[PDB]
Write a protein that binds this DNA or RNA. Structure first.
Ligand SMILES: [Mg+2]
Ligand SMILES: [Mg+2]
Length: 109
RNA sequence: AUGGCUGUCGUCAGCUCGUGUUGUGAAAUGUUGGGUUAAGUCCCGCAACGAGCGCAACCCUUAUCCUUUGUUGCCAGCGGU
């Protein structure tokens, strides 16, 4: 069942009321998530996620921070899988048709 | 009442657009920020991504050197004084 050795929870106060259902925490000012509920979402997650990787995988691994950027430009970068490892230029989906040519310049370059 | 022309802030760094986003809306963002430039100059940052007019460059001149050209210009090495 549990696979996350030391991923436990995180984040002291700064919590978000909406995150009670998945919190069982306490230990020292910072709450532990609900290890026993995290996983039941690897079900459904990787499921409906796989259920469209076969329907034809088009993903986009959004993840940024000089502390994980290329730990995402990884076997994630590789497969049926796109990504963004730095500042997410805003409107890049909603303005893909202005940005599409921001690509044409990348390649032409 | 005007065309054309001209002073002027000021060769100051400014003025805008599309698309995206935001607000009920006038509008906003972009162009609020951190540096730096002569500069909206540039670099980082950034719900914006991109662009046009201005900044800059392309023009004249000046400072070095090469090619060509030697009269009306030049005289280094020559012969004539
Ligand atoms: Mg400019
Ligand atoms: Mg100019």
């Amino acid at each position: 069942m549990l696979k996350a050795g030391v991923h436990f929870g995180h984040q002291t106060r700064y919590w978000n009321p909406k995150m009670k259902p998945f919190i069982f925490g306490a230990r020292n000012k910072v709450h532990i998530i609900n290890l026993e509920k995290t996983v039941p979402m690897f079900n459904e997650a990787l499921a409906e996620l796989n259920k469209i990787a076969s329907r034809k995988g088009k993903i986009l691994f959004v993840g940024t921070k000089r502390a994980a950027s290329e730990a995402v430009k990884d076997a994630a970068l590789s497969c049926d899988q796109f990504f963004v490892n730095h500042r997410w230029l805003g409107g890049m989906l909603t303005n893909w048709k202005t940005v599409r040519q921001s690509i044409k310049r990348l390649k032409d370059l």
